[PDB]
Symmetry: C2
Subunit: 298 residues, 2 copies
């Protein structure tokens, strides 16, 4: 049961960075567009939307640092390489390796957190930003309440000090990754996913080192990411890059607050739309997602 290739025609690049290789599928031509997945997935989550994107753009579908087939930089007490700030710097360096110093960027889930952090830290690097089904990390933590704590319990679970989440994830990793996939879809099962993509996610999640990375990501998400965001809210720093906020009508970011209102606080130029899906917009509603992206990225 090999993984196999969900991006016919796309090349496969290993992009060197100072913190380790980024893996990417690259296809298409035209302006560069970087696509960033999140948790618990890999780049293959774009497999239904990348083709439609690659009709107009040089689509780079990257595994986040530490995820998928990207190298896992050694973490540290502060989870530094898995802070969205560090990850954005690494991806910037990755894109520089391909000669893209100014590119479009669409991120889903953790990848979206990299992406808006990228926009805050290095807005000159982006022509346009799209974030899929997230609010800024600071917003999740500020709105933390009973309802949210139960809904995004993994934000605090996975952010527990090692080795607690790692050992518990170890208890049934196949179950957990499928549970997370299914439970944030509209259908509530795995039917929205290509089973070959589910297999990519399952294989990456089978790896304890990959799971530790994801924990590091969430640890960063509870601490440094939050602190970094807090500096920006308190400074009134806004994302100046034109952005599109997509969210699933039945997803994660929609009922922490109305996501366009929240993002309007963070970005001076945002448009947004609900998409009839759960969290996994590019796979639950690929046509609608792809069409929204292509229209906004043009």
């Amino acid at each position: 049961p090999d993984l196999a290739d969900l991006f016919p025609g796309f090349g496969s690049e290993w992009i060197n960075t100072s913190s380790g290789r980024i893996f990417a599928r690259v296809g298409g031509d035209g302006p560069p567009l970087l696509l960033l997945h999140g948790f618990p997935q890999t780049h293959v989550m774009w497999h239904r939307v990348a083709p439609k994107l690659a009709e107009r753009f040089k689509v780079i579908v990257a595994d986040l640092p530490g995820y998928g087939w990207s190298d896992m930089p050694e973490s540290d007490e502060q989870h530094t390489p898995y802070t969205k700030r560090a990850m954005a710097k690494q991806l910037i360096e990755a894109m520089e390796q391909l000669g893209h110093v100014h590119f479009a960027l669409a991120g889903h889930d953790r990848g979206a957190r990299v992406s808006y952090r990228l926009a805050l830290d290095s807005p000159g690097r982006l022509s346009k930003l799209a974030v899929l089904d997230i609010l800024p990390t600071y917003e999740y933590w500020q709105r933390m309440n009973r309802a949210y704590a139960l809904k995004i319990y993994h934000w605090s679970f996975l952010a527990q000090p090692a080795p607690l989440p790692e050992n518990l994830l170890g208890g049934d990793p196949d179950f957990y990754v499928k549970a997370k996939l299914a439970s944030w879809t509209r259908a509530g099962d795995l039917s929205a996913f290509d089973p070959r993509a589910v297999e990519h996610y399952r294989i990456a999640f089978a790896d304890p080192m990959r799971r530790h990375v994801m924990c590091e990501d969430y640890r960063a998400g509870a601490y440094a990411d939050f602190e970094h965001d807090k500096i920006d809210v308190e400074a009134g720093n806004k994302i100046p890059v034109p952005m599109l906020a997509l969210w699933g009508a039945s997803g994660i970011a929609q009922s922490a607050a109305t996501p366009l209102d929240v993002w309007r606080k963070w970005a001076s130029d945002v448009q947004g739309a609900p998409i009839e899906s759960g969290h996994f917009l590019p796979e639950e509603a690929p046509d609608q997602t792809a069409e929204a992206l292509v229209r906004f990225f043009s």
Copy 2:
């Protein structure tokens, strides 16, 4: 498993919702002691014997815990709501002829205790709660820091079988992690190793683990709704109560415990004890002294 209450009898008390296991010793006015998670009645083994010099001490496994039976849960986790547990323990005490008793609870047991106190205050002479605030207050104070600190409130309340499946890979690790994590030392040195063994063995049973999750699911849903109604109705515990908390325990991380408890209780005395969460094991003498003095007053 070791007998940590030499001289205490044992009772299996039938109730409508299953048998309640208790160790019973001493003589005098009836004092029911309720443990919490991930413990069993044996957490009281260092203070019960001092209590048993002055009271008839009944050291009960909560419903579904320890050796108490595990009523089947349901969609609303009814049997593991503190309201149901309270009713079941009332029925258990009635089986012993104690319709009016003193009650001290720790952790989940303290939640049963203040719920009992709210639902059926006429059952209680006095109430002591150890290292908790009301469930409602934890959830109301559920911000970033606190969500990280008591992440298990929301992890264990996830729909079955998620926590159950994760817990089942290495049960020993998790019960040990939680015991150690909530002590002032961050290790297991407070505990009697024989008591840890009781805790670990109870936790090794997947049904027991499920029960614990059900308890926490109740704690996230029904229990909170029940507390919510009371606090928004201004219902207060009318029974003299003692709030004890660990200076390094859980309840203090959420708020000033005495202030919170004075919102819930018309007659509350409070004292911190230099201890982590596990007052009767980390600080047995202080805890036993505090309880003896409060209950014998």
